[PDB]
Paper text:
Proteomic analyses have identified the major components of the sorting platform for the Salmonella typhimurium SPI-1 injectisome: the AAA+ ATPase InvC, its regulator OrgB and the proteins SpaO and OrgA4. Here we show that a novel, heterotypic interaction between SPOA domains serves as a scaffold for sorting platform assembly in both injectisome and flagellar T3SS. Our structures suggest a partial model for the subtype-specific assembly of the T3SS sorting platforms: the heterotypic interaction between SPOA domains within a given T3SS subtype functions as an adaptor for ATPase and its regulator through interaction with the APAR peptide.
We solublized the pre-coiled-coil region of OrgB (residues 1–30) by genetic fusion to T4 lysozyme and found that it bound to SpaO SPOA1,2. Herein, we will refer to the SPOA1,2-binding region at the amino terminus of OrgB and its homologues as the adaptor peptide of the ATPase regulator (APAR). The SPOA1,2–OrgB(APAR)::lysozyme complex was crystalized and its structure solved to 2.0 Å resolution. OrgB makes substantial contact with both SPOA1 and SPOA2 of SpaO, burying 570 Å2 against SPOA1 and 470 Å2 against SPOA2. In the APAR-bound structure, there is little change in the conformation of SpaO (1.01 Å r.m.s.d.). In the crystal, these residues form the docking site for OrgB residues Ile17, Leu18 and Ile19. The OrgB surface area buried by these three residues (360 Å2) accounts for approximately one-third of the APAR's total buried area.
Residue numbers in the entry:
A (entry chain A): 5 to 69
B (entry chain C): 1 to 196
C (entry chain B): 3 to 69
Write the structure that this text describes.
């Protein structure tokens, strides 16, 4: 019925990759972060922004409906 | 903060990433890449038992002065205050890196409160920021702000001029080996003085 | 054609309670170590992970593991 727990991802950035890169990517390679983000995601839903502070993360928004 | 501790790969500009994002491991093997932990460990050492520095006072970890007081007690009282567990004048490696992360964080927030150092710090790339933090470690925020003309040349990216001028200092005259490593870092913007 | 790679500093399975507690700025603790294990994700699927590194004009992730 209802959903109990929600898988959150704290995203600090993203890069649009031409699928042709996988699999040239290997261990020791570097992947550039082209767009800096600081967003909370649950699946494809962006819930809000967070901030990387001294001892962890503080979340601002969390808009859930 | 966490971003000050990051490993820095001092590739010059421009990067030629594959499809704008992928730098291959084989391309990176040419570069010597470290973090500021690795840098100040080379200049100041890493010790897990209390010792007396050259100065010579009670110190611990990476350059962490405990007391100028000659009493090993109280040197131990501030070491203990620092870790939060009863160390009998003996810390672990993790505690040392924790103490280091705190000491760097304090150094950077010091630089940023200083009207002379902040503009220069803000203008520099991350490898040369490490060099500035290095100097703050060695001689304090106020002492580094005294390098008026060098700091201005660093801000204007006059790297060769700044390196020539820094060589005329007391700092260089007194601790030449370390000074030359830090000045090499300003001149080149790479960690190469730390390859050994 | 294009896929969007996400760089994920942290993941956590959360209840509605934890979610509303987080919704009002309750500190989520990370080891200072955390940037050494940044995860790379594409379409909700984890692809690999590595360490956040500083490059001259940008951040990047040096790959430790991939697929």
């Amino acid at each position: 019925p209802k959903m109990l727990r929600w898988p959150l991802r704290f995203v600090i950035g993203s890069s649009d990759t031409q699928r042709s890169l996988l699999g040239r990517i290997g261990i020791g390679d570097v992947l550039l972060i082209r767009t800096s983000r600081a967003e909370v995601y649950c699946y494809a839903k962006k819930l809000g922004h967070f901030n990387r502070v001294e001892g962890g993360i503080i979340v601002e928004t969390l808009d859930i409906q | 903060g966490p971003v000050d501790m990051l490993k820095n790969i001092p590739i010059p500009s421009p990067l030629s990433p594959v499809e704008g994002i992928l730098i291959k491991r084989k391309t990176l093997e040419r570069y010597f890449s470290i973090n500021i932990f690795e840098m100040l460990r080379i200049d100041e050492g890493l010790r897990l038992k209390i010792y007396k520095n050259t100065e010579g006072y009670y110190t611990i970890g990476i350059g962490h002065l405990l007391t100028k007081s000659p009493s090993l007690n109280a040197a131990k009282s501030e070491l203990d205050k620092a870790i939060g567990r009863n160390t009998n004048g003996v810390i672990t490696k993790d505690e040392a890196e924790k103490l280091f992360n705190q000491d760097v964080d304090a150094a950077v927030r010091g630089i940023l409160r200083n009207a002379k150092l902040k503009p220069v710090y803000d203008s520099l790339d991350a490898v040369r920021r490490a060099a500035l933090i290095n100097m703050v470690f060695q001689m304090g925020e106020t002492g580094v702000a005294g390098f008026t003309n060098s700091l201005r040349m660093l801000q204007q990216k006059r790297w060769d001029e700044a390196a020539v001028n820094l060589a005329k200092s007391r700092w260089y005259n007194q601790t030449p080996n370390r000074a030359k490593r830090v000045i090499t870092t300003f001149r080149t913007g790479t960690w190469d003085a730390y390859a050994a | 054609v294009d896929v969007k790679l996400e760089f994920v500093l942290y993941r956590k399975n959360v209840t509605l309670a934890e979610l509303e507690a987080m919704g009002q700025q309750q500190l989520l603790s990370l080891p200072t170590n955390a940037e050494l294990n940044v995860e790379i994700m594409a379409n909700g699927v984890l692809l690999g992970n590595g360490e956040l590194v500083q490059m001259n004009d940008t951040l990047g992730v040096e790959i430790h593991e991939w697929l």
